[PDB]
From a paper:
[name] with a DNA-binding helix-turn-helix (HTH) motif is a putative repressor regulating the transcriptional expression of the codh gene cluster. Monomeric [name] adopts a novel ‘eighth note’ symbol-like fold (referred to as ‘eighth note’ fold regulator, [name]), and the dimerization mode of [name] is unique in that it has no resemblance to structures in the Protein Data Bank. According to footprinting and gel shift assays, dimeric [name] binds to a 36-bp pseudo-palindromic inverted repeat in the promoter region of the codh gene cluster, which is supported by an in silico [name]/DNA complex model and mutational studies revealing the implication of N-terminal loops as well as HTH motifs in DNA recognition.
The T55I mutation in [name] led to enhanced H2 production accompanied by the increased expression of genes in the codh cluster. The KD values of the wild-type and the T55I mutant were calculated to be 61.8 ± 20.5 and 948.0 ± 130.0 nM, respectively, clearly indicating that the DNA-binding affinity of the mutant is much lower (over fifteen-fold) than that of the wild-type. To get structural insights into the reduced DNA-binding activity of the T55I mutant, we determined its 3.4 Å resolution crystal structure. The overall structures of the monomeric and dimeric T55I mutant are virtually identical to those of the wide-type. The r.m.s. deviations of monomers and dimers between the mutant and the wild-type are 0.827 and 0.941 Å, respectively, for all Cα atoms. Despite this structural resemblance, however, the T55I mutant has a remarkable structural difference in the orientation and conformation of the N-6 region that is engaged in DNA recognition.
Author numbering:
A (entry chain B): 2 to 139
B (entry chain A): 4 to 144
Write the structure that this text describes.
C-alpha cells in the first residue's frame, strides 16, 4: 500500500488478522470490501517479506562462515562441507553434525533429503544458524 | 529502491572486510562521493527494514504492555505481570530481570521514560522494545 514503512491501515489489518479475525469480519469493521482488504494485506505481507530479505543480506555479509549448497545435493553431506572450511578459517562452529541437520530439516528448501534449489548456509556474528537463498560474489 | 542493489551489496561487502571509503572507490571505478551516497543510502534501507520486522514481531507478540512518557520504570513490571496472567502467564523473567532490561534498551532518562514505547514478549520469549503503541487497535469489536 506504500513504501519504506507500514501505514496505520496496514498495522490495523495485520493486528486484527493476528487476533484471529477473518477478512470478511475486518471488512465490516473498517467499512470496505473484503477484496480490497485481501489486496492490502497482500501488499503488507509482501512489504514485510521484502524487508526480511534485507536483514538476511545484512547478516549474510557479516557472517563468520558461509557454505553453499546446490540443487540436488544431499542434506547429510552439508555438515562435512561446513566443518571442512571451519578448519582452514580458524573459527568455532558451536554445533554438531546432528545439531545442524535438525536445523536444515526445519527451515531450508529441501524435498525429503534432497535440496530443491540452491541456498546458502551461514553462521552469523551471534553464533546463530541462518539460511539465505542468495548466492553472491567473492 | 525496495532492496539492496548489487553495487550497494559490493560496497557493504568490501566495507565488512575492513576497507576504507577511499580504497573502495577505486575498485568500483567511481568517486568517493558516490560511495558515500550509496553506503549511507544502503544503511538507511537496513534500518528501515529492522523497524518493519520489529513491528511484525510486535503484532505476533504473546503479551505487550504500553509505557507512556513520564511514567515510572519500576511500575512496569507489576503492570506486565498483572495483565500477563489473563492468558497463560509465561514471562520467564523476574521483576529485576526486566528492570535491568529497561535500563539497558529503553528510552528512559534516569528513572523516568523519555518517550513512549511498548515492552512486549515476542515469539521467542525474549524481551523487546518498540516505539509504536498499537494497543488502540486491540479495542475494536
Amino acid at each position: 500500500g506504500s513504501k519504506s514503512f507500514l501505514t496505520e491501515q496496514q498495522i490495523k489489518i495485520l493486528r486484527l488478522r493476528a487476533r484471529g479475525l477473518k477478512q470478511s469480519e475486518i471488512a465490516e469493521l473498517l467499512g470496505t470490501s473484503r477484496a480490497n482488504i485481501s489486496i492490502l494485506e497482500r501488499r503488507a505481507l509482501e512489504k514485510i517479506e521484502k524487508a526480511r530479505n534485507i536483514i538476511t543480506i545484512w547478516e549474510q555479509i557479516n557472517s563468520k562462515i558461509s557454505v553453499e549448497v546446490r540443487k540436488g545435493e544431499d542434506i547429510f553431506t552439508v555438515p562435512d562441507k561446513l566443518f571442512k572450511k571451519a578448519d582452514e578459517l580458524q573459527i568455532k562452529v558451536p554445533y554438531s553434525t546432528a545439531e545442524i541437520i535438525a536445523f536444515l530439516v526445519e527451515h531450508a528448501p529441501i524435498s525429503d533429503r534432497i535440496a530443491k534449489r540452491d541456498f546458502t548456509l551461514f553462521l552469523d556474528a551471534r553464533d546463530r544458524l541462518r539460511i539465505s537463498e542468495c548466492l553472491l560474489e567473492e
